[PDB]
Symmetry: C3
Subunit: 587 residues, 3 copies
């Protein structure tokens, strides 16, 4: 007995067959374009199972004829999809193969009028993102209704292209391995939806997946142990959303890795991350987030998360914040950020809504380890200087660290404590309940409870601060304990607080602490070519400096500061003897 | 002339055939469940090769009928395995396809009574870890015996599920690419073995592989240039073992990458790493290592290795050490460790067996770059305070570094040199041959040979240390060179070491070094509202401070410390002239 | 009607068939070795399309017989390639399948006389790099000629094995996914070429690809959003080249990730990187770069790039530089470099051509975050010490940072400002227009415009520098503001600059800044067991120290430094009264 030829699966119904007969189906449908290189698709061998003659699911069993699957791999064509045929709705055939338990190969573009879903242990593989994937032509949803999962009412009937749904009885859509295809809406649709709605996912790999022409690219609530490699989310509003708060399920995430992923076009947030724990981004990028005159809120919104960004990038950013960090630890190492137009302000500012590139709030920790940040504007810009952002606002127990090798397209301007939430210079502003360790203009500034002291069993060598035309009387606010040098005899003047003009000085200043009020002392060395005079003075807290006091020593006469004022000894504390070469001169 | 149908491969034996005849085999076996969606498996086209009529290997050539392989891909079914049939031993068919040179697709669960091995250039692909893989039902081994490899006697006859074995004449099982399946023992076995025994491996990728119900998960001796992505090792003893010392082969490893890998359930070590050079872990996790009252020895045991952990995690840890590092460099960046019950102690302690979270020994280097560590207990805990661990023990030339932004669930308690190996506070303890650079309670402590000095061509501005009700005579052990402020007049007393009571002070203390004994000097500014007194004293090494000395200066009388004791001049060193307003008063 | 058997595709031409007939072709060619396990390859089902009877492309349509492709996957055999047949040129069949739009499976070694190219959306999968891939047997090129792409005339007619070419109308060969094969020249060819010439590529993944027996391994001009996993480039001149400057296209690159990649054998550069932005290397290696007596120029040449290396390695390096960095930011974290023979020098040195391990020029930023660097030689080495390199040369606005936990095989020797470009010690040399923050022999050295000051609202406790038999008069070049201790009475001598010999000292030195010339002052405490003498002196800029001055205080007599020289008071500023126990002694 020999293998019988059948033109299409539709021809199987009428065929006369004995149990166990084998047929070769040329294609699922008759080709409509015989000029194609690949006209016959979706066919293959079938074996007749007489006991199932009444069954017809349009795919694995058609009138008893069971599809012979090679190495457990099928394509949507085998269930009746059509390739690169925009007028044909492939939704039903795609859905059948996605839940078949087979590996699914995507071999062109398939058009769909409803979302398609996958569950667990599903491998889907196309050959690349230009030519393989799903094009959704409507805003229609699934029609599955509510399900209760771990006591939470969940619903998957959203306007999306693809949806991840746990198996019945499970909590996560897990052990899935998707690669090499695109998810897009028909660009003509006036309203777009979600690319991939994957609320509850785990233990999965996503590679070389492109979603574009979406409102929201990739959207999840609770994801754990997933890797994302070369995933691009192009969206009009938010590209990547993790920890979505809009369901009954409590957001939480762990161990998400993103390698070579790409956020583009988002007008609200590039990345919207909530409860993202153990998250690493490696050589990721973000292009064209926000637009001129229509800023995004932030490139990265990172809330109750801990994230490391390793050699990541952005190009062309119009946003109020570069990073909004709330309750989050973010280590940004060797970033390269370009064309960031930091000219946007909120209508009404507040602790968590302000014009800073790094908005670091509510016990966050943000560190810039090297990197280059192309923030276009500081207050001296001739076109946007009046609109420039701060570099950072740090509040509510947070800490912000900037390495000495981090670079910026234009100079930083200042750093200091601030009670404001609206800024006018490219500076680092922090509250009294915050900590900073930041280089600004080559000077490292450390302040706050995390930086209370430095105790080292080590020797220390430092340089003096070289003074310009400035008063050493008026350094109580700007310097604490510090060594000063005045090497210009023109600037070493009595008007500038020195005991005598016209000679260089080294000055040790002591302080309780630089501040609005302080205790101070100074030791001044008036350094001449082969001699010096030595001077001490003190400043009480809230008082002007007291008069300078010239020290008496054995290589100088003892000349009092005023005549007929000071004594040698007292009646109760005499000097024992006095040895003079000449008799006392009584004036 | 036409393709002939054959029901099963067993039917090929009796088929009279001409050379070059083509047959289509419906399936390897007759189906036993025609309700399956996929009842016929393991069949395919065969061509008769008359000159091989006597051959039957049950797979590629059956009584001369040669299997026609599509794109060099086969399944164990093609050699006679059965899917999801626990009573059927698929060991032999699996082994045949694994050494066939074909890509191997795994399409369900296959049960095995012996280990299965792979060599080199082997690609094995399942669709996911829930439904694809090998279930081993015995503790049986391979039966290959000893082989000599590079002069070393090696033996692969261990109780494992899968074994990597070099090709004959080669040193490594290399250029393998495994993905998307599980290796498990039957949970009913009283004793379990190794999931993957891969002693000598190289130049390979492992992705989306789960081992569970094992004693040891993944075990290797010499691995180089391998990547591991989404590999989970669930084991009762040790999850991941690299550089295993128990063979004739010298352990050594290079360039192993772990991305999104997961160690679970291990009761001895989560990771046991030996000679692991150039190893990166990215967003890996570890859950349920140890149990309450049954601690693991360490989450990570890292010996003669260098490892970077980037945004890794753990949840639920009962162990004596978090990290044991011996001769190892470990950089832990932005960790997030949760529910670590640091209440375990060894019965006898030693340099390399002690109750510390970070046991940093024998020329190790361990750095915590940020991160959050959920160590539950310090000595204040009401229920486990008497059982808490140290944060760290550092010895034998090692260095331990804790960044200022690293956080802990409960506060660190102290840091200091210790000769003990058993601790009772959540502190940092180090020997005289160790180095530390660690923030404790907002104070950075640097000590040891790696931190001998700081030489900066930079100015320095610092604050004073504000004293409480403290003696400045008794700061020789706790402070070195340091500026002090006493802003409370009530505490500026002679009993507290001040020369002049009841005014605020700035004090410069000098020291050889804080310690049990030291050289010291102090300069004290006794600050009043418009004047001060200036004082010096010294303390010799091993001696009490000498008396305070009030300096003479040109804005004060010269009143000696005691009457009729000190002279103006000497017979051999006179003052030249003396100018007094009044005649000398001879008392 | 049944499926008709056909022996070979050559037998199709003489097949009388009706429209729609189905044939099964045993193999593309008649097998020549029926002892093979897989003798029949490249066949499959075909369907006769009468309207195309005149077409014969040797692949998808042979005299009207259209190939039935399963799940859009083919092998070069289906177009007439031969496996493991060195005398057969498979170039034309390979090329046909690479541009077919199918997934391409590689099932052995194919030999080629010309390069083969791919465009976009191409997936190519072998089972491993030992047995799958392309062997090029000539130095022949493509013959496609000049093409204008985005305004630049490009030419792809180079001697390469595989070439990436954009589709017409596109700028990049993109969305390709290649894995699991090798690209090699016939080792017998006297001259080798490029392995993979991929000038313009984007949005792609490359995995488990080996190039070897090449002159240049992988060569690109403009690559963005590509990942490379387990890619090995073995080349005689340069292993990896990105940003190749030798075309009309302006070099630029972004977001390239390398995980477990390996550069070997290169004699000029291991990695030659130009305009590589956002690049991360993870657990990559480099072996046998340069040769003894024939050094490479550098292991890494990194120009106008920013690169992070995470736990990377090298073994066996003969090169003039380890890293040449020009206008680049490079963070090298936890490196492990072994067997680096730093004994090579240029014939004529210059700012960008010198004998340094880290040549850090033109506004570069290079940081060593931990790591271990096996530089074999410093100047005391008994076989090569006279040839040793510097550790680093830092110039032209660059910054070089060395962490305290970075280790070296042999000790570093010195650090300082240098006007030289040729070195003879393993030191850190930098220009006056450069910055350093580097530990050397346990001491942190910070200098340059990036390290101008440190301002901390924090207290500070430090140790004294313990002096040997050294002069405190000659510490103006080596220390600035510093505390010194001399605990040896034998070394506290007038010859060593002390004012009073034979007692231990604490000394506070002040300075404008350590340098060739400086302002200085010193306060010396000559410490006896229950007393001290207190001394001040100053040194003017460019002058020797002035004489020491012993301070007068109330617990000492006032003995002048010379007799009959100094006065008590002056005619114009008298002391008011004098209280003596005895009458003045007029000497
Ligand atoms: Zn067939």
């Amino acid at each position: 007995v020999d293998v019988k030829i059948v033109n299409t699966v539709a021809d199987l119904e009428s065929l006369t067959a004995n149990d166990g007969m084998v047929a070769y189906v040329k294609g699922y449908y008759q080709p409509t374009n015989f000029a194609l290189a690949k006209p016959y698709v979706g066919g293959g061998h079938r074996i007749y199972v007489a006991s199932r003659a009444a069954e017809n699911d349009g795919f694995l069993c058609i009138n008893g004829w069971v599809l012979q699957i090679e190495n457990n791999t099928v394509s949507p064509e085998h269930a009746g999809a059509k390739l690169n045929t925009p007028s044909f709705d492939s939704a039903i055939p795609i859905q059948k193969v996605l839940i078949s338990g087979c590996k699914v190969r995507l071999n062109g573009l398939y058009h769909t009028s409803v979302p398609v879903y996958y569950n667990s242990n599903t491998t889907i593989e196309g050959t690349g993102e230009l030519d393989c994937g799903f094009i959704k032509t409507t805003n229609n949803t699934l029609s599955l209704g509510n399900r209760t999962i771990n006591g939470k009412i969940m619903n998957f009937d959203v306007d999306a292209i693809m949806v991840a749904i746990p198996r019945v009885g499970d909590w996560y859509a897990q052990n899935n391995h998707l690669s090499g295809f695109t998810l897009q809406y028909d660009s003509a649709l006036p309203t777009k939806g979600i690319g991939l709605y994957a609320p509850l996912i785990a233990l999965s790999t996503y590679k070389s997946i492109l979603t574009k022409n979406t409102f929201e690219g990739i959207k999840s609530v609770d994801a754990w142990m997933c890797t994302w490699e070369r995933v691009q989310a192009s969206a009009s509003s938010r590209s990547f959303i993790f920890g979505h708060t809009g369901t009954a399920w409590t957001p939480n995430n762990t161990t998400q890795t993103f390698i070579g992923c790409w956020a583009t076009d988002a007008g609200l947030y590039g990345w919207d991350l909530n409860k993202m724990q153990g998250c690493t981004m490696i050589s990721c990028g973000a292009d064209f987030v926000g637009a001129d005159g229509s800023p995004a809120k932030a490139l990265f919104k990172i809330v109750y998360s801990n994230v490391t960004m390793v050699t990541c990038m952005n190009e062309h950013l119009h946003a109020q914040n570069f990073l909004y960090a709330e309750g989050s630890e973010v280590n940004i190492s060797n970033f390269n950020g370009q064309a960031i137009y930091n000219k946007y302000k909120p209508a009404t500012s507040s602790w968590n809504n302000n014009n800073s590139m790094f908005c670091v709030v509510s016990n966050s920790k943000v560190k810039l380890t090297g990197g280059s940040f192309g923030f276009a504007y500081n207050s001296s810009d001739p076109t946007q200087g009046a609109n420039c952002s701060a570099l950072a606002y740090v509040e509510g127990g947070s800490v912000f660290e900037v390495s000495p090798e981090t670079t910026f397209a234009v100079p930083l301007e200042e750093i200091g404590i601030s009670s404001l939430t609206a800024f006018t210079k490219l500076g680092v502003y922090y509250t009294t309940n915050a900590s900073v360790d930041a280089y600004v203009k080559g000077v490292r500034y450390q302040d706050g409870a995390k930086f209370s002291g430095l105790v080292m069993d080590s020797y220390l060598s430092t340089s003096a601060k070289s003074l310009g035309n400035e008063s050493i009387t008026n350094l109580r606010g700007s310097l604490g304990n510090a060594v000063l040098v005045q090497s210009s005899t023109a600037n070493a003047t009595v008007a500038n607080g020195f005991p005598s003009s016209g000679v260089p000085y080294l000055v040790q200043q002591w302080s309780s602490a630089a501040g609005n009020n302080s205790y101070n002392a100074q030791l001044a060395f008036a350094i001449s070519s082969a001699s010096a005079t030595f001077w001490l003075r003190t400043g009480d807290y809230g008082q002007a400096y007291a008069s300078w006091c010239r020290l008496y020593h054995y290589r100088d006469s003892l000349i009092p500061a005023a005549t007929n004022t000071y004594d040698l000894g007292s009646s109760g504390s005499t000097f024992r003897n006095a040895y003079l070469q000449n008799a006392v001169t009584v004036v």
